[PDB]
């Protein structure tokens, strides 16, 4: 599985990106920091696509993916 970590988000920018992610795939382990967001994503949309759409708001440097074992 994969995990997405968004950093340096503005106020409310976290919620916005959650719903944004809710259109491409389904998030599991949703953590909402005051300026961060992290969630687990299944093997759906390729990382580039997620990044392409998220860049409608944030910069690529704010997105990071990470693996996770079962």
């Amino acid at each position: 599985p994969r995990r997405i970590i968004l950093s340096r988000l503005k106020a409310g920018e976290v919620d916005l990106l959650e719903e944004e992610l809710g259109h491409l795939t389904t998030l599991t382990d949703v953590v909402k920091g005051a300026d961060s967001l992290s969630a687990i994503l299944p093997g759906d949309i390729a990382e580039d696509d997620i990044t392409a759409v998220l860049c409608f708001v944030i910069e690529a440097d704010q997105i990071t993916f990470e693996t996770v074992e079962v």
């Binding site: 491409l24 696509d49 759409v53 409608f56």
Partner: protein, 128 residues
């Protein structure tokens, strides 16, 4: 945001273009020109002077996605903000629009507020 930014609102449904023209006027943008499809839009853009393009998705002759691609591939126009208007918030559309180089997307019908949010963010990412 220069309130004299020359917008080009592309849509094959006149009424949708009228609505958009109003929403913009409400937000203070009065320089709005219309086009009925990608081909019309491209012909009008040739004259230059525009600074933003709001474009609908499906249109005869040349659809929004193609208009985006063509704009992105053209020298003088490549750096022109294009806001894609889709009718459904389906991922395939949303992803294709991002891959193509759209400055954003908004699902219709949308309010003046929604429009204004989308516009503010696009202006933000370009410091304009």
């Amino acid at each position: 945001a220069d309130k004299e930014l020359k917008f080009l609102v592309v849509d094959d449904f006149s009424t949708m273009r009228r609505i958009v023209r109003n929403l913009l006027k409400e937000l203070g943008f009065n320089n709005v020109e219309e086009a009925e499809d990608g081909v019309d839009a491209l012909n009008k853009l040739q004259a230059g002077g525009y600074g933003f393009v709001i474009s609908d998705w499906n249109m005869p002759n040349m659809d929004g996605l193609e208009l985006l691609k063509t704009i992105r591939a053209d020298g003088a126009m490549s750096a022109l903000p294009v806001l894609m208007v889709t009718a459904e918030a389906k991922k395939e559309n949303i992803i294709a629009a991002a891959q193509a180089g759209a400055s954003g997307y908004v699902v219709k019908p949308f309010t003046a507020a929604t429009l204004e949010e989308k516009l503010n963010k696009i202006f933000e990412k370009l410091g304009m």
